[PDB]
Predict the structure.
Amino acid sequence: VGLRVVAKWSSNGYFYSGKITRDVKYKLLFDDGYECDVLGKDILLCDPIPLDTEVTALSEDEYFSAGVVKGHRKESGELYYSIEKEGQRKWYKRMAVILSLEQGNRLREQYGLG
Amino acid sequence: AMLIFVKTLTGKTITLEVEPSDTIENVKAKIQDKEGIPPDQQRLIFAGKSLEDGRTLSDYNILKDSKLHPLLRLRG
């Protein structure tokens, strides 16, 4: 409780960053500004998405696409990811970086809850 | 079947399976099917470009290859 988390609220759905607020299933307050109760089985416990993790990032032109984490940067309580796509790196808001069902599934063995 | 994201006014970002020839009415209807939002209470945009009824996704050159998934937004 109070830990950073990347979690999904739907089968075959995407993982989004947020925090655990209360233990009920767990109450999740997402960085997107939404809060709701999600299953524990759909919760990844890794605050900084580890280097070289394949993720889904929202580029400046408003398209989500797959990329790879190459670096983190914490600027006064706000994280930014350095994501590489096709050889080019860009900086992304924490809320801009998400995980697909597969991308999230790869991390389950190591950072899964329970 | 191409995947798009749609950001609701609640902050919640949902997904939708659309055809490139799907009219904006169809997409709003899907949004109604997933979020109960009446289509008449929907204002879609992509990259500052208004998505209006009577037109289609191909009209706006939104969708590209399967790798890219556009983030649509509901305005206020």
